[PDB]
Design an enzyme around this catalytic site. Structure first.
Site, mmCIF file in Angstrom:
data_model
loop_
_atom_site.group_PDB
_atom_site.id
_atom_site.type_symbol
_atom_site.label_atom_id
_atom_site.label_comp_id
_atom_site.label_asym_id
_atom_site.label_seq_id
_atom_site.Cartn_x
_atom_site.Cartn_y
_atom_site.Cartn_z
ATOM 1 N N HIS C 345 -152.663 -64.098 21.418
ATOM 2 C CA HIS C 345 -152.428 -62.977 22.330
ATOM 3 C C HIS C 345 -152.273 -63.474 23.760
ATOM 4 C CE1 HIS C 345 -152.034 -59.119 23.916
ATOM 5 N NE2 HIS C 345 -153.264 -58.649 23.813
ATOM 6 N N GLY C 377 -154.665 -52.715 28.927
ATOM 7 C CA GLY C 377 -155.928 -52.527 29.612
ATOM 8 C C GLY C 377 -155.826 -51.473 30.700
HETATM 9 C C1 LIG Z 1 -161.755 -66.035 23.392
HETATM 10 C C2 LIG Z 1 -162.788 -65.742 22.307
HETATM 11 C C3 LIG Z 1 -162.360 -66.449 21.021
HETATM 12 C C4 LIG Z 1 -164.153 -66.296 22.726
HETATM 13 O O1 LIG Z 1 -164.829 -66.800 21.569
HETATM 14 P P1 LIG Z 1 -165.453 -68.253 21.893
HETATM 15 O O2 LIG Z 1 -166.692 -68.462 21.107
HETATM 16 O O3 LIG Z 1 -165.829 -68.313 23.466
HETATM 17 O O4 LIG Z 1 -164.372 -69.416 21.622
HETATM 18 P P2 LIG Z 1 -164.254 -69.882 20.080
HETATM 19 O O5 LIG Z 1 -163.301 -69.018 19.359
HETATM 20 O O6 LIG Z 1 -163.661 -71.397 20.116
HETATM 21 O O7 LIG Z 1 -165.657 -69.909 19.269
HETATM 22 C C5 LIG Z 1 -165.527 -69.054 18.128
HETATM 23 C C6 LIG Z 1 -166.476 -69.454 16.990
HETATM 24 O O8 LIG Z 1 -166.133 -68.713 15.826
HETATM 25 C C7 LIG Z 1 -165.348 -69.552 14.899
HETATM 26 N N1 LIG Z 1 -164.170 -68.838 14.380
HETATM 27 C C8 LIG Z 1 -163.159 -68.370 15.163
HETATM 28 N N2 LIG Z 1 -162.261 -67.804 14.459
HETATM 29 C C9 LIG Z 1 -162.634 -67.879 13.170
HETATM 30 C C10 LIG Z 1 -162.024 -67.427 12.025
HETATM 31 N N3 LIG Z 1 -160.827 -66.783 12.164
HETATM 32 N N4 LIG Z 1 -162.611 -67.633 10.864
HETATM 33 C C11 LIG Z 1 -163.775 -68.265 10.800
HETATM 34 N N5 LIG Z 1 -164.407 -68.721 11.870
HETATM 35 C C12 LIG Z 1 -163.863 -68.544 13.080
HETATM 36 C C13 LIG Z 1 -164.911 -70.755 15.773
HETATM 37 O O9 LIG Z 1 -164.630 -71.977 15.071
HETATM 38 C C14 LIG Z 1 -166.198 -70.922 16.630
HETATM 39 O O10 LIG Z 1 -167.269 -71.456 15.841
HETATM 40 P P3 LIG Z 1 -168.045 -72.617 16.642
HETATM 41 O O11 LIG Z 1 -169.323 -71.953 17.397
HETATM 42 O O12 LIG Z 1 -168.515 -73.623 15.663
HETATM 43 O O13 LIG Z 1 -167.067 -73.321 17.723
HETATM 44 C C15 LIG Z 1 -162.840 -64.229 22.019
HETATM 45 O O14 LIG Z 1 -164.182 -63.824 21.703
HETATM 46 C C16 LIG Z 1 -162.318 -63.363 23.150
HETATM 47 O O15 LIG Z 1 -163.017 -63.135 24.110
HETATM 48 N N6 LIG Z 1 -161.077 -62.819 23.085
HETATM 49 C C17 LIG Z 1 -160.590 -61.970 24.181
HETATM 50 C C18 LIG Z 1 -159.090 -61.677 24.014
HETATM 51 C C19 LIG Z 1 -158.693 -60.388 24.681
HETATM 52 O O16 LIG Z 1 -159.528 -59.674 25.184
HETATM 53 N N7 LIG Z 1 -157.392 -60.020 24.715
HETATM 54 C C20 LIG Z 1 -157.000 -58.764 25.364
HETATM 55 C C21 LIG Z 1 -156.758 -57.692 24.294
HETATM 56 S S1 LIG Z 1 -156.060 -56.199 25.047
#
Ligand SMILES: CC(C)(COP(=O)(O)OP(=O)(O)OC[C@H]1O[C@@H](n2cnc3c(N)ncnc32)[C@H](O)[C@@H]1OP(=O)(O)O)[C@@H](O)C(=O)NCCC(=O)NCCS
Ligand SMILES: CC(C)(COP(=O)(O)OP(=O)(O)OC[C@H]1O[C@@H](n2cnc3c(N)ncnc32)[C@H](O)[C@@H]1OP(=O)(O)O)[C@@H](O)C(=O)NCCC(=O)NCCS
Ligand SMILES: CC(C)(COP(=O)(O)OP(=O)(O)OC[C@H]1O[C@@H](n2cnc3c(N)ncnc32)[C@H](O)[C@@H]1OP(=O)(O)O)[C@@H](O)C(=O)NCCC(=O)NCCS
Ligand SMILES: CC(C)(COP(=O)(O)OP(=O)(O)OC[C@H]1O[C@@H](n2cnc3c(N)ncnc32)[C@H](O)[C@@H]1OP(=O)(O)O)[C@@H](O)C(=O)NCCC(=O)NCCS
Ligand SMILES: [Cl-]
Ligand SMILES: [Cl-]
Ligand SMILES: [Cl-]
Ligand SMILES: [Cl-]
Ligand SMILES: [Cl-]
Ligand SMILES: [Cl-]
Ligand SMILES: [N+]
Ligand SMILES: [N+]
Ligand SMILES: [N+]
Ligand SMILES: [N+]
Lengths: 389, 389, 389, 389
Positions: C345, C377
């Site tokens: 995204h 948003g």
């Molecule tokens: C960015 C985001 C991924 C932050 O999560 P994060 O923990 O800081 O970064 P990560 O994804 O690397 O960590 C995710 C954890 O879950 C795991 N994980 C992620 N996706 C996975 C999946 N699809 N299946 C299984 N496990 C998964 C990762 O490996 C990681 O495990 P770890 O602790 O061993 O590293 C997410 O939570 C986020 O904030 N997204 C915002 C996007 C958004 O708001 N867009 C606007 C929409 S209008």
């Protein structure tokens, strides 16, 4: 009165952004304080003062020496303070602690140094405010630790000045660096660093890791070292191979009078016979140990030929070759187990690190007269003479 | 051997972001080194070592003590180093320099402190990188100088603990602060600060400015003091009026043996009789001077009633009242010309500032026995006894 | 007047701090502009204007849209500007470019979006100056991109509100996320993304790397999804698995009238039939596509049953499930090749990314009527109706 | 279809770090939106969309246009987005809003611009981390607003190129600036700016301040202008006097069809007849209005002699003289009330600021045909033709 070193200890020298990438310096210093206490059979409640040299304490909090003393278990009634003579801080703190007992103002002193160059922050003065334009975030490690305040260039450029005035070829510097790497790896494989090194537990997020070996000691070959590019002058001779690196670590020693150790039944590592500190031109700060070691030998009544072991900190291959060639002592007794080019160079702790290496090697092979010395930025040098028993 | 103070000098104490808002600390210290040399009739080429206490040296460069010594004219053969025992750094450096001559490792020492709290930068560790989210830029003055590393609150909160355990009312603290402000103006208008203060020239772009008067000394009234809000606890008693401020300045003193001054025809300001430093609980670090002064008097063989003049650093109105009430000395001889509440409190330099005030106060009225003392963050205190002639 | 999409292209969606960790957004957009020109057989000298949506342009320089057009080869006589409607910026730029040709002010428009969330910096207002205390360095990605300006919490908390109002269990959100992950791997392994993706060459210092595959497609299993912790509310349902990530990428499309494409013998990918944008409550911005898609279908004269394919951007599993049950269209035609939960995204580029995916998938299976929509948003939504040929 | 400007308003142009030193841009824009609605007698519930140009939105939050619309009272059902064509953003947003009603996708549009150059922060990319060395904090105002992305120098260096290629002496540039300074003061003292300026209440901590007058209008004489130093080239001709400054402000206009205003009984300020945007060489972006005004006049069916009033934004004295000499229109009708050299230059709002000044001055003196135009960084220009009703 005569002051002796009852015990000594040091942490493993970690690489820049390595095992100690997130460990504050006072936590490293707390472990060496606890170690020298257990090794000497002296409780923490008997320590009068703790003197720890540190060059880069920004962001660590109010007086990291007090933090290291309290965390180690030293009671609140005791005192602790930090000092900064750059690279000679670790050794000068031991001499300063010796002076505390000599004047009768203390009985038991824990002195040494601690430095965490990985934890050094970037800073900028912002109280006046930047109304317009860009500004620079200054690396405190480079500015407050590795840059000469008078001429503006790195400490490596000072080693280039020593290389030109002493006419030290690139091959002679690389050959000296490979010799230091091979002595350090030989000492590590034979376990000659186990007596001085105290294991440090790095509390991490995915379990704890035990660090008990210098991680900068690698395998150096002459051909790969000759292929490196100069790190300071675009057409110079000092490279990343023949120069010491950025490191984290801590080292200390427990001081007391000879009559005190005899009353406690302690077999000391050595007696501090004399010490000295002299200044030189900042352009060639690597030549610091040359007059500082001569002044310490003169104060002790010793000749250069009377020395049995020598620990000269190898800040750079160029400055180390010049010191050995001017003083003219036998190089086979200088840094028998390697130097800072292979082990590491924690600025505030290097003065006590080479003292730790010197003390245990003198006890292990029965040496009687030893000397440790370092070069100091800004044009200074420090040296100390140790006698067995 | 017996150590005497041949001369002493200090710069005017500047206000936070005031006259010294852009002046580095080593430039202030360079002026005090030249002053104590000219006042004693001793050339710069005779100085062996310069010991300057400094708490906030981040961003100033490699070893600001060496920078201050070189700019003052001290030759490169001499050495210089910095130390950090927080607020007691200025006085502890004098005791350390006294120990250099006592052990025979030096003959002439310039010792003191320098601090530029306006020049303290904001820092942040950025080597690992912030992958996402906000992070804090830490004020090194607050973090490394004014925040307790064990309990996490400002030094002013420790004064609240002293105020509660000693039951010191807000009116009693304000009355003590107004008394300190009025004593400072009486001494300043009578010119009792001219002997100690050395004028400093602030080289600016729009002409040079001469700073020769303490810029924190204003006019305080009891009613304006009662209207101030508590500065630390939201419902406390310590305000901006009854607490010392953030300040810049420097102070130093020239040290030599008593026999040396007699050979040079120098009439010293006083003889250092004894000194001491003791630790206390960090919760009540303001009580530091209480055991430190008793240990210093005990080492000198003096009773509290034998003292003729006393300079006790006023970090806070609450902590100052507690120190005078426990030791029980006559308050009419304590801080006769005012304290840090009205003059200022440069952390690394306050220890030598009150020593300067004490020495000249003893010479003007013929006092025989004096004592200076300060409280130290983290739970420590330092004191020194001086005897006239 | 009738506007058609002659060509379209997009880069591979890179992971946060991944392949495009140091690639500016305008370099990604420059390749997509060159692609849509080469794919349509239109020279760069014929482009009238370039409209690129971008949300995080801080630090990249003056008008990154102009930078992308110039580097792509568009001559200086043409114009270029950026726009910001958050997540719907990529799709709104296509509608804006359609309006340029509809009003007769242009003939050929390249419209799309570009975003490099890895290159988003940390900022702080420092013109007034911080006289004392700590201050925060603000992450522009979180503040200017992912934080609601009215209620102060992350966009993920908005998905928590939508999940509660629709009563979407955590298992239902995890099952929806695994369905998109499995569809994304089926499309990538079968090469259904090769037609839309244009390869990007990351010019590095240690050789160049060719990026031609979405690096976020990893594959989700139902058990590993259930073990993840909630990422926003301490007792919520939105986790890192069922929520879209932070990504880099760019996408664009070439616009012209239907008579122009027929005049040049160009076969367009589809005709823009209608578009719409509506606002909703910021607490539940995920419900944006619900009134926006109905308003677009109403303008086109279409019923929900008339749609053959649908591309609804999956900002979160919660907001996507609510849209599918409210509109009630067949889920087998919605995001047939996966969604943002598995692909990524990039905010400013997602609007054109789902349009690129929709155009080529309609050509692959001979669909006639399609619709793309996103949530924005602050409480907004955008939608557009496309007809093939 | 025919589009008219039903109402218009603007705030006073504030100085850099002046009255609006701490006022966010969306707060300035919120008052202008409320003004154009209240002046036209149109409720906020009738606004379909809000289009605001802004160049420096870093740190202000998600979509500052949405923030300005909500605070102004526009309901959540309407949409809002920002656009960035640098210095032409304020005028281009008005043309974009005209296209929304022309295509039938909207009925009521609030279009304009808002800029707060004082609130622009300093930024730096720190996700990868700075492992060693210093780094720069980049001023977003200079980098993202005033520095050419292709040649690397300030916009003032571009004016030097225009001055050299057109051979405009330093005396001619200063004479042009004082002419605009004197025309601006005649308008301010005669109250010719009161109709367009809407008062803004700066709610501060030490009481509220009412801002209702452009604070940049000062007294300029030919002698003081000649004594100034060149601000860009060390031996150039562009100084702080003959160049526009950094300013804050906002401006907007209410758009609707001509039949819509007749249905509501509203008397419009003028009808939008035509508009145009053309690109030029970035080295001489000041020549932008020359081809942009010719393209706008040909689309309107007007000759240069048919114009009654002209508002050409004075980014620099050099670029304005070249535009007036090339187009050759009567200078007595160009910027009759002064220009940006004396009033100010808010980047995102300047396009609507000169549109506000043009509309009310045409109504004040009964002008029939007017034109507004600006130059855009990166080598662009924008123009619009207005006819009074
Ligand atoms: C960015 C985001 C991924 C932050 O999560 P994060 O923990 O800081 O970064 P990560 O994804 O690397 O960590 C995710 C954890 O879950 C795991 N994980 C992620 N996706 C996975 C999946 N699809 N299946 C299984 N496990 C998964 C990762 O490996 C990681 O495990 P770890 O602790 O061993 O590293 C997410 O939570 C986020 O904030 N997204 C915002 C996007 C958004 O708001 N867009 C606007 C929409 S209008
Ligand atoms: C010399 C110095 C500048 C090195 O900086 P650096 O280049 O970032 O350190 P690096 O580890 O990245 O060395 C870089 C290269 O040299 C190579 N290298 C380093 N040490 C080597 C060795 N011992 N043998 C062979 N190759 C070596 C590395 O592999 C690397 O090559 P690569 O990047 O392609 O993998 C730094 O260590 C320094 O400032 N030292 C001075 C310390 C000092 O002044 N102390 C105080 C003196 S008083
Ligand atoms: C004073 C301190 C607490 C910060 O508060 P501050 O707001 O920065 O103090 P300021 O002087 O800048 O402003 C305080 C207010 O009190 C007023 N004030 C200060 N001194 C006053 C006095 N002596 N009489 C009357 N009013 C006074 C100031 O004029 C100001 O009023 P204002 O709001 O109208 O401008 C700070 O100096 C501090 O931290 N001191 C303790 C440091 C310390 O512990 N040192 C020793 C280490 S052990
Ligand atoms: C020109 C510029 C560099 C000025 O920077 P500056 O240093 O902050 O200029 P300042 O107003 O602060 O100071 C200028 C000096 O000249 C004097 N001065 C300025 N304008 C004057 C005038 N019109 N008449 C007489 N004196 C004047 C000021 O009082 C000041 O006196 P000082 O020497 O005591 O400081 C800056 O405003 C700029 O970059 N402008 C260009 C923005 C731009 O690109 N606009 C076009 C967008 S396409
Ligand atoms: Cl290797
Ligand atoms: Cl083709
Ligand atoms: Cl056209
Ligand atoms: Cl391709
Ligand atoms: Cl409609
Ligand atoms: Cl009004
Ligand atoms: N090395
Ligand atoms: N005070
Ligand atoms: N995800
Ligand atoms: N100006």
């Amino acid at each position: 009165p005569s002051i002796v070193i009852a015990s000594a200890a040091r942490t493993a020298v970690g690489s820049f952004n390595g095992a100690f990438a997130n460990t504050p310096a006072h936590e490293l210093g707390a472990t060496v304080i606890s170690a020298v206490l257990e090794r000497a059979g002296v409780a923490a409640g008997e320590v009068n003062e703790v003197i720890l040299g540190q060059v880069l304490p920004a962001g660590e909090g109010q007086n990291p020496a007090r933090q290291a003393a309290m965390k180690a278990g030293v009671p609140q009634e005791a005192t602790a303070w930090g000092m900064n003579q750059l690279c000679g801080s670790g050794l000068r703190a031991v001499a300063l602690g010796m002076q505390q007992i000599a004047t009768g103002d203390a009985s038991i002193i824990v002195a040494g140094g601690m430095e965490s160059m990985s934890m050094a922050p970037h800073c900028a003065h912002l109280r006046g405010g930047v109304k317009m334009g860009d500004f620079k975030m200054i690396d405190t490690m480079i500015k407050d630790g590795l840059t000469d305040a008078f001429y503006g260039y790195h400490m490596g450029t000072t080693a280039e000045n020593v290389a030109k005035q002493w006419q030290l070829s690139r091959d002679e510097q690389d050959a000296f660096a490979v010799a230091s790497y091979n002595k350090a790896e030989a000492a590590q494989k034979d376990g000659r660093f186990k007596d001085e090194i105290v294991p440090f537990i790095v509390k991490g997020r995915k379990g704890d890791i035990t660090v008990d070996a210098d991680e900068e000691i690698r395998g150096a070959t002459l051909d790969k070292m000759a292929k490196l590019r100069p790190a300071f002058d675009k057409e110079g001779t000092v490279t990343a191979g023949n120069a010491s690196g950025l490191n984290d670590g801590a080292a200390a020693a427990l001081l007391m009078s000879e009559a005190e150790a005899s009353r406690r039944g302690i077999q000391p590592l050595g007696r501090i016979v004399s010490w000295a500190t002299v200044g030189v031109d900042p352009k060639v700060m690597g030549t610091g140990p040359i007059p500082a070691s001569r002044k310490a030998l003169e104060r002790a009544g010793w000749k250069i030929g009377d020395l049995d072991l020598v620990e000269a900190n190898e800040a750079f291959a160029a400055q180390a070759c010049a010191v050995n060639k001017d003083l003219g002592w036998d190089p086979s007794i200088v840094n028998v187990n390697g130097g800072a080019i292979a082990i590491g160079h924690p600025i505030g702790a290097s003065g006590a690190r080479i003292l730790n290496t010197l003390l245990f090697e003198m006890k292990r092979r029965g040496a009687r007269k030893g000397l440790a010395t370092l070069c100091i930025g800004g044009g200074m040098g420090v040296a100390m003479c140790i006698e067995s028993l």
